[PDB]
Symmetry: C6
Subunit: 264 residues, 6 copies
């Protein structure tokens, strides 16, 4: 005679992870994983907070009216990949321009160099151009982490920007690197806006798509070193309302001026 209360009426349950794609403003619906995804993303969460203003009357304060004063959307997660794209994303810059699967050249030194010189001889200058950054790799000795900028390439001789402080022997390598600057000088205000898309699925493989026309990344670069577990970057984003001059305004007003709309 026992009766069960609060039982299920369907099968739409969610146990999975989600993919976060960030791209240029105006192309929220046309984001692809290869070109716009972040990478290994864990614990993606979406939060909504609403605030109301109430008018009350009487001793017992009976509400006669209630007015919404603001709703806020927040996106957070953890990223487990340190490449130029993810670092640029974490710094609030356009990270989709870079690539996570790029190669690193590794040239080989064929002639020893002493302290005080600014020229080096390599096996072949293929993949290295003027203005590139290289990090010296020494087979024996401590790693001082010395980076040099290539100024001129003539034949097999590379001229570095500044004189050497440690000797380079035969067999050492010059590993190509990318320079990332934490300050963007072309942004007057320092705030840059993007578009976002979130993709997931149900237990029955029913897709879930969440589209945010405008987002702002309010977090910063966080790198913690340790031997216990893998380092990760904490992400935080907020959704904003579009204006007349903003790209994608037509999509914004077509969907009832919604910051976020779902396709379930």
């Amino acid at each position: 005679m026992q009766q069960n209360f609060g039982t299920a009426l369907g099968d739409g349950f969610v146990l999975n992870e989600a993919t976060l794609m960030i791209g240029a403003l105006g192309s929220a619906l046309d984001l692809t994983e290869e070109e716009h995804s972040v990478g290994l993303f864990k614990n993606l969460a979406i939060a909504n907070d609403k605030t109301f203003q109430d008018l009350n009357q009487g001793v017992t304060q009976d509400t006669v009216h209630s007015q919404k004063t603001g709703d806020n959307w927040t996106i957070s997660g953890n990223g487990y990949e340190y490449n130029p794209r993810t670092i640029m994303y974490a710094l609030g810059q356009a990270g989709f321009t870079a690539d996570p699967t790029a190669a690193r050249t590794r040239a080989v030194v064929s002639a020893p160099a002493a302290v005080g010189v600014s020229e080096i001889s390599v096996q072949s200058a293929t993949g290295l151009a003027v203005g590139d950054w290289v990090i010296l790799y020494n087979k024996l000795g401590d790693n001082n982490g010395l980076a040099y900028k290539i100024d001129a390439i003539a034949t097999n001789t590379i001229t570095l920007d500044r004189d050497l402080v440690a000797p380079v022997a035969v067999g050492d390598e010059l590993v190509k690197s990318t320079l990332i600057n934490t300050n963007n000088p072309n942004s007057c205000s320092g705030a840059e806006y993007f578009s976002a898309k979130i993709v997931s699925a149900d237990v029955n493989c029913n897709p879930i798509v969440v589209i945010v026309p405008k987002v702002q990344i309010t977090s910063g670069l966080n790198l913690a070193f340790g031997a216990t577990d893998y380092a990760n970057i904490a992400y935080q984003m907020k959704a904003m309302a579009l204006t007349r001059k903003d790209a994608g305004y037509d999509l914004y007003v077509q969907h009832g001026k919604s910051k976020v709309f779902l396709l379930t």
Copy 2:
């Protein structure tokens, strides 16, 4: 000679879950599980908080009078189902209009489509109409989560709203979906009111019914993705006093102007 203190005088103990039904304003007593229930609901709690104002006299502050200044009712729980009805409920919209047991069409593509086209050929356009939303499902490749709106259906040819950015091969599927907008443009204030009903039972299968003529959903949509446990939505509701223009005012004044009344 040992004596027992604080012993039981009856058998009315409660160890069970409860069913929460939300419906239109004015029909609090006629809610049915199939049409108005939320679904899998866990940890339903009802809370009452009362505030008093006291007048005191003397050095020791002896109370001469005490006046109630307000009582508040709050309903909370966890929902484990992600369908249009529950999402609409969580967003503060009329979720009883939708259905949790609806079907998804899944059409089959019979002709390959390249990048830059906006027309596709399917096996049969049964269940798909103009203005519907479809999510492309690719058997091979990454899932970019691309959604399209059907603009015109002629014979077996479907014209999508915008040009393709990824190719569609033979055997791909178009999964029907529903569009949910987080902003309701027909609400001047943004606050919408409903009726609620809670059903449970004792250990001896004695029913318990709680009826709330007016409620307001003060929470928001909360979706958290992870591989540890199933995702759920946290709900929060508050009871309010009815006015002359509100539907169900006759029931409100008949029961002594009570926000909540019980039938145990």
Copy 3:
């Protein structure tokens, strides 16, 4: 040669539970368990907090005088019974009028009823009167928790207050129930005062009696549903000083104007 410090001088130790009785104002000494007890009560605690005002002199602040500014008594516990008496107690109403061992009638339907009718035929209308509340119990199907008020009883035909929204078959039952309203309309202020008594015993079966002439219940109804453990109601009471118009003022001034006095 070892010496023991802080040793016991008697045998008055307390390891037991206590019984809490709440009754009408003025009869604090004549409360009986059957008519005034709450039921299964756990973790009963009595707390006293005193505040003093000190006058200080000198740089080191030597106290010259100290004046008491107020003492407060608080009673709390957990109740594990959900019946009309305990719910009325938790709501701040006179719960001793109801009974925890009352019966529920359960009538049997002998004729099917369709949707849209407001009359039903039962086996026998014994125990059911005009104005009673009944909850429909269906053997098969979901439990929508539908409650009806009896308007008129003629022969074996019962006329309900409103039309049916779900069909009733043969074999269904009408379970009698009691209506509890959370708002008392006959109280101008909303604060109602009672008397209390606490009974316990020592390890040597020596009775302990605590008598509080006036109490106010400052808590509210708290119901939490779950499958982990039994639901309980948290109680909170405060002791107050009696006035000239209050019943039992003679007992108050006879015992030195004490809010609480003990008989150990």
Copy 4:
């Protein structure tokens, strides 16, 4: 070659409990355990807090002077005995007047009494006097905890202050009790001062004596009922400076106006 730092220079270590004695003002040095001790006392702690006022100069704030503005002494512990003496101590009253090893009379009823009578017949009225309080003990039935005051004793007939609400059969007992009132009407302010003494010993059985000429009990009566562990009362005391009119002022000024002095 390893060297040990922070080694011991003596054997004065303390692992034991302490005895707390509270008595009348002026007799701090002549307190005895039988007449002034509290009983089973656990976790006795003494705390000192000092406050200073500093005068600083310069950008780096170099202190030129420092003046003490007050020192405070606090005594706390847990008591595991519920008798009139300990309850009076916890309420801030002179508890040394009562005794913890007193007896309880227990008279036997030799004639049944019905509801509505105010006279009872006992075996022998030895140990019971006019004005005493008795708690009725019933062999069979629930324990309502009924207390009566004896008004007149003639032969074997005892006249109670108020009419009976429950019947008394043959074999029931009248247990003598003591009435404790939480409010002292003979204290104008509500603050009463006492003397204290603390006795302990070292590991080598070297006595430790702490003498506090004046203390004030700032805590209140705390009784918590439960089946997990034994109930206890939390104590808190503060030391104060004596004045000219206070008893024991000669001892105060003889020891340099010290609130607490030790004999180790």
Copy 5:
């Protein structure tokens, strides 16, 4: 090819305890363990906190200047010895005058004494002088912790300051004790300054010496009794800058006006 980062460059690691010495002002460099050490000291910690004031310009608040506004040094630890020296140290008094290895006399009573007398006969008055304090030790009976001051010694008869309240039998002992007063009447302000020294060693037995010319003890006497673990006293000290009139000013200005200097 794996490379290790953040590797050690020497062997100066510290796993040991430290010795804390407190002595008179002006002799910070000449403190010896026997005469100035505290005793069993555990968990010695040294803390430095610095505060800066910054001047900022622009919207992004670029610092143009930063000025130190104060540095603070704090010394803390736990002491596990209760003797006159450590108690005097904890009370903020000159504890180096006392000795931790002093003896306690223990005289033997050779004649019974009744209640009301103030004279006692002992075996031999060796080690006891006029003005000493003695604690009576009774072989049988409760320990009331009674302390008496010797007023006059004639032959084998000792005259106590006040009359007896408990009888003394044959075989009882009079244990000599020391009187400690918590208030120093010869200090106008209540703040007394000392010198400190800390001694430790590395893993390779390389000594570490820390010298603090002036310290102030800001803690108080803390005694907690219990049967779980040994009682200890928490210490706290702060370093201060010396003035012209302070002893050791020459050492202060010779080392660049440093509050603390190290010899590692």
Copy 6:
């Protein structure tokens, strides 16, 4: 048919420790581990915090503009080495001038010295000069930690600055030490600026270099003694913007006025 979401797109994961190098202002790119490293460093973390100022319009507060008001960089870690270089670094002084692998002389006494003398005879005065500091090491007896300054060396006789307070026997040693003063008298403000560099690697041995042209050490010396685990020093640094007069300003403006730039 199961699909995986949030998958990895590369192999740039980080599980390793990092090396922190601190050197003179202006040479951020030319720091070497032997001369500028701290030593055993654990749990190195880099944190970025950004603040924005928003202009809002309407009841719902739609942001029209957002302006950055400041970004902050913080570097923290734990150091497990106590030598002059690390102590000077922790005190905010130029620690790269000292060396962590220096030797300690240890001279041998060949003639006993009594209390009150200020001259001592050693085996050979090699490695000891005028003005050096020596700590006396006694083979037998307690360690008082006595330090002396050498005033004059003639033949094998060493004259100490002050008279002896403890005797020195034959076989005792004089261990050379270094004096560190916590206050720098040549700094007008007390704030000194340095350059920093951080070196690490990926799982595939791809170097990571972080360069901070200007840092300020805002922490202080923290030494905690105990027998449980090894003592360590907590470090904290903050990055600042360079000015015209600061060294390395050319590097600052060349990289877009960035406080921190990365080479990954």
